[PDB]
Design an enzyme around this catalytic site. Structure first.
Site, PDB file in Angstrom:
ATOM      1  N   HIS C  45      25.378  76.803  22.281  1.00  0.00           N
ATOM      2  CA  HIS C  45      26.415  76.512  21.311  1.00  0.00           C
ATOM      3  C   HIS C  45      27.400  75.529  21.925  1.00  0.00           C
ATOM      4  CE1 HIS C  45      24.768  79.305  18.497  1.00  0.00           C
ATOM      5  NE2 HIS C  45      24.752  80.252  19.416  1.00  0.00           N
ATOM      6  N   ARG C  70      23.568  79.602  30.354  1.00  0.00           N
ATOM      7  CA  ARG C  70      23.073  80.278  29.158  1.00  0.00           C
ATOM      8  C   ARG C  70      22.235  79.248  28.401  1.00  0.00           C
ATOM      9  NH1 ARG C  70      24.969  82.803  24.188  1.00  0.00           N
ATOM     10  NH2 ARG C  70      26.468  81.139  23.695  1.00  0.00           N
ATOM     11  N   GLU C 146      21.494  90.733  21.103  1.00  0.00           N
ATOM     12  CA  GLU C 146      22.311  90.115  20.069  1.00  0.00           C
ATOM     13  C   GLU C 146      21.915  90.501  18.657  1.00  0.00           C
ATOM     14  OE1 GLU C 146      23.731  86.238  20.945  1.00  0.00           O
ATOM     15  OE2 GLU C 146      21.803  85.725  21.876  1.00  0.00           O
ATOM     16  N   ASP C 172      27.078  87.483  17.625  1.00  0.00           N
ATOM     17  CA  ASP C 172      25.804  87.584  16.923  1.00  0.00           C
ATOM     18  C   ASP C 172      25.476  89.030  16.600  1.00  0.00           C
ATOM     19  OD1 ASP C 172      24.449  85.066  16.318  1.00  0.00           O
ATOM     20  OD2 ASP C 172      24.379  84.727  18.482  1.00  0.00           O
TER      21      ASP C 172
END
Ligand SMILES: [Br-]
Ligand SMILES: [Br-]
Ligand SMILES: [Br-]
Ligand SMILES: [Br-]
Ligand SMILES: [Br-]
Ligand SMILES: [Br-]
Ligand SMILES: [Br-]
Ligand SMILES: [Br-]
Ligand SMILES: [Br-]
Ligand SMILES: [Br-]
Ligand SMILES: [Br-]
Ligand SMILES: [Br-]
Ligand SMILES: [K+]
Ligand SMILES: [K+]
Ligand SMILES: [K+]
Ligand SMILES: [K+]
Ligand SMILES: [K+]
Ligand SMILES: [K+]
Ligand SMILES: [K+]
Ligand SMILES: [K+]
Ligand SMILES: [K+]
Ligand SMILES: [K+]
Ligand SMILES: [K+]
Ligand SMILES: [K+]
Ligand SMILES: [Mg+2]
Ligand SMILES: [Mg+2]
Ligand SMILES: [Mg+2]
Ligand SMILES: [Mg+2]
Ligand SMILES: [Mg+2]
Ligand SMILES: [Mg+2]
Ligand code: NA
Ligand code: NA
EC number: 4.1.2.-
Lengths: 252, 252, 252, 252, 252, 252
Positions: C45, C70, C146, C172
């Protein structure tokens, strides 16, 4: 605070979009300021990688067209990262089956409708606090139909809920049918297949688009009822223009 | 193993060159493969910095045109680094005096003719062991004439030994004369000044070039005897082509 | 010659890590020099692609924190290329099943334990000739939890040998449970699920981490026994700080 | 179709601007969407080169603040290339004499007022066909006052017509006066010099700005009548925020 | 917390440095981990621009050598931006006069000793709060001697206080004297000039360095008393190694 | 208008290729101008991403060697985008089964032979209008054999029609067999496996290649009949050369 292509459709008109295979922000902004509703950045048949697409999305939005991407592949995590970078239309190549269309749809919607991962860096800046409730409508998604197999499965592909419709890849389609991969072709079997895909998309209540190589062919496709027409690649248009300038300059 | 523009001149013909304001290698190669003798990369009125020009020089050479650069400024060390990166033509903007022309010349020649620093990374690869003896002929250099002051000093600028001649910047010239900065202008005072510069360059036995915005104007400039004509910027040609495609696509 | 996060754990303390969604090396080094044990670079993201992550890993190591990533997706070859570029911690998103956790583990260990391909460009420079014998301990791996599906499968995910434990993605998770994707949430169902994941990880003798949006929430998570806590994203912290500076500057 | 800082001034209020030393477009857009009238990109004390500033200018404009650049040096061709890339405010460091201020002014105006070279790639897209007639008003220019010499020459610097005023560099100023280069300093000699520069700028009918390190100091500077206040660098704000998050997270 | 080259000198030994004309961080780190005291990045005769040098400085420091830059030109603001990016040694080409040496010195010292602008992004991270008091000692500066004019002025160049000494550019020197620009030359006039420069530098109590093309020539230069010897360019070493591998592979 | 490696084979000789793990165009061109038939760019064990490989392909072609890529993974869309960027040889790592070899083959041929998507940006420029009819011969494809599983399946892998043969990854192979991942190893079990793979490839009428770490080992592999030998990685050769220069320079 609206996707410009969906606004076209909601107001009863088709959308016309540009098509970029050259990286960079300056021509992206310049073309977005023309009477294009959207500009598609091609990440399949170009040297445009993620690092180069990211600023182009910003430039297209500033210019006043909706930023679209034709991805390298129908891959959910690739698509999600583009969505979070401010791609508001996704055209996925080589969608050949209902399952692959379902994979495309899954990436374009948050739970419960899809499985899109939440972290909308640039869409949250554009749309503000109410983004989540409207997120699905902010994105347009089209599955590409480019093979005999996709033709075989066109009705099942069109039954997939999370995508807006299909986008024909006419040179790959001609090639898979055994014909020259000529853009804007007159080859009857290809022309008939394209018409068939359009007819089935509209019978399904879905949108249909097509890649065009010229403004005249695009005009005919709009008259035939295509909802989303692209015309024409920046590199092709630039090369043709340069050829003509040289011919004019070197003429007696 | 020859500068293609100098070969044109040596064989009795002018050179026609492209003009790039968009960064990237793909259109650079594509346009170089057309019937351009050279392709000029504009580092003044563009977002093209050194990091982006470097691969473009490679792409132009591969395509089969001579790589030229219109620099941001007449700065010796900037010019030298471009030469060592494989720029084989230098067009320096805003050369207004004989001294500034001498500064341009100094960067284009090794001692004793100039003060170019030795470390020719890419020219040594292209030309091999005999590069040093032929280095001056491998590079073409043009001082730009863009102001009333440069007009005032045109004969003294043309007397400078280490440059091949001058290159007119017609929109800056029109603006400094108090007229609209229109490319390919018909404004009599500007047209007369351009003709004057050409006449003095040829009276001096030097080369003269001009920036053109269209193939038709370029044809006329070649007929008038200009030695180096550029036509036309990639961004301008692309924008005009896109405008026409849209007009054709959206026509009834 | 030690992974700083594994050293924390070996010495009986949790690790605190930073979280970067902005590309670049200067803030990466600056934050690594603070009392962070690690700095996680978010490639999901964010607009951070491989070309931009690579120098950031160097900068974090120089600053004195362990470089973590990540990833965009749980993909073995992506992960391996990051390991060979000097990522020493991998957090893989959306690990929903034991098989997917096994896929993560496979990328983090050479044969016979895993199938990691050998060519450790930067780890060999850091660790020297004895790298191979110690390679597994130099890397930390966490599977992200998630989704409702990952919750359903948490015990089987925790049974996978080649990963150190799990890392909760709380926004999430809240969204998949039908709640607002709010960081540091108080929503009871989400809070209970997070506690459950921690309890099962420790019952399994594994490590558990969580993404935090504030220093106060991170303190509580450390008190609850989380082994790996991140706080807070560079962009979020910077935006909040700028908002406050503006409010202070514009106040009467 | 207006420079937002000049609009502030025309409507009787000062302008507040951000200050970026970190490259990249995401935080640039995010901060531009806050209640900043402008965002200054620092190309002197940062790793931001031209290739990285160019997309940042686009992102700031999209976010809704005026894009400004504090250049590495007062160099006309550098400044012109930034103007043509869509920098609409220029802050030039280390302007110590009237002549240097005249050099700054020369780059910001087309003939006859200045010698700016014509080729406004991005301003022509923003402002359209009428750009040339309004070009000077679209750009704001400030000379930096950072030395004892600039203090000695402040009245002559303020007499230069083509610049809007001056911008104090308070850490360089303190250092040249023999004091610690502390931002927002209370050192009497520095405070007195800053006040003096403001008083002379307003006696001259010109604008005066200052770099601030905190929102509280910026508020005081606005109360004192400064026309252009920046607060505070992205890296400094981010570092301070991270320090506090860590302190909060690690507290008992 | 020490400049490694100055530490060599302070402890009575010369420094040996690498020389990079290829951009990138991986070979920069790898070579810095060898028994080089410093690694010089060449920004004159290479395609390395600022955007590419910045991460290389980080990589060299991490590898354990002092990061040096041979700049494109003796320009104060260029040099200052490199210092603030963590270049701790500056070698400026084509320093021909005392005034030019004074210009170099001015950029390397804060007021009152020089006019370096204050904003030491990366040096403040490396050295911490006490940086300002020690800033001058953290940077090494050498003026290059590459012309007959620099030879004529060698004593006056060596009298400049703010530089550590001179660095011979032996191929430019040979060329300006009318000889082949051969590295490690035996040409008597060049050899005599190099010896003369060394003798005058040491008579002045200053440091002297030289660019070498081979390890054997570098050994001789160290025996002759040179304080700073570079050997040898990455591209030259790599090209020679590849040539030999090919010859060995293709031999009968 | 020929793939240089296929020309070697068609004329009865093996091909020798370089191997690059360092990004950049300058050493790529320099090594391509040596007596290498091809230069392989390693995108698996390097920091070379797509953005950096693209200009390197251009530079290798200009230098006069065939551009090859060893990809990060056997992924069809990745491979297709490299083909359209002017990679004319593909070496895919970790091909362990016939199905995976069929996946490689599918990406290298247009319909009906494969499923390669049509949009050959750079191959159309190189080969011109007749590209489609000759496209398959312009590309060389090798599946890598690096595991016990690939050894188990070697005959079935070699039966796949759309690939030219196999390429041994000898350090991964040694490691999977439980031995040190030493290049050019003498370990009997590894040596026997390598010989076996060569014997089966030639029994199948296919090509076989191997990665070498030295020119002497490469000579032996050519004598043994390997069709495609690489020697040796740029970083390894450069590091070894630098080590020797330092040893020579620092010797008494
Ligand atoms: Br239009
Ligand atoms: Br087309
Ligand atoms: Br043509
Ligand atoms: Br034009
Ligand atoms: Br701290
Ligand atoms: Br957050
Ligand atoms: Br705000
Ligand atoms: Br500050
Ligand atoms: Br060594
Ligand atoms: Br050398
Ligand atoms: Br050779
Ligand atoms: Br090797
Ligand atoms: K538009
Ligand atoms: K349905
Ligand atoms: K040509
Ligand atoms: K003369
Ligand atoms: K730390
Ligand atoms: K287990
Ligand atoms: K704003
Ligand atoms: K005045
Ligand atoms: K070292
Ligand atoms: K002195
Ligand atoms: K070759
Ligand atoms: K077969
Ligand atoms: Mg297609
Ligand atoms: Mg001009
Ligand atoms: Mg998540
Ligand atoms: Mg300052
Ligand atoms: Mg030199
Ligand atoms: Mg391998
Ligand atoms: Na991928
Ligand atoms: Na400059």
């Amino acid at each position: 605070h609206h996707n410009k292509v969906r606004t076209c459709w909601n107001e009863g008109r088709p959308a016309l979009a540009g098509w970029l295979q050259l990286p960079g922000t300056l021509h992206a902004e310049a073309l977005a300021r023309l009477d294009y509703d959207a500009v598609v950045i091609d990440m399949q048949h170009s040297p445009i990688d993620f690092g180069q697409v990211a600023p182009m999305l910003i430039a297209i939005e500033l210019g006043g067209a909706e930023p679209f991407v034709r991805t390298q592949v129908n891959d959910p995590s690739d698509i999600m990262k583009l969505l979070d970078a401010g791609a508001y239309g996704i055209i996925a190549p080589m969608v050949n089956t209902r399952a692959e269309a379902q994979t495309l749809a899954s990436a374009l919607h948050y739970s419960p409708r899809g499985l899109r991962s939440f972290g909308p860096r640039r869409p949250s800046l554009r749309y503000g606090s109410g983004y989540l409730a409207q997120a699905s409508e902010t994105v347009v998604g089209l599955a590409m139909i480019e093979t005999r197999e996709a033709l075989a499965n066109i009705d099942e592909i069109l039954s997939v809920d999370g995508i807006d419709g299909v986008f024909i890849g006419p040179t790959d389609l001609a090639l898979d049918l055994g014909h020259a991969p000529l853009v804007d072709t007159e080859e009857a079997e290809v022309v008939s297949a394209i018409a068939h895909v359009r007819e089935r998309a509209h019978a399904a209540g879905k949108r249909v688009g097509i890649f065009c190589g010229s403004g005249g062919f695009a005009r005919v496709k709009l008259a035939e009822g295509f909802d989303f027409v692209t015309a024409a690649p920046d590199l092709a248009m630039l090369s043709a223009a340069a050829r003509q300038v040289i011919a004019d300059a070197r003429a007696l």
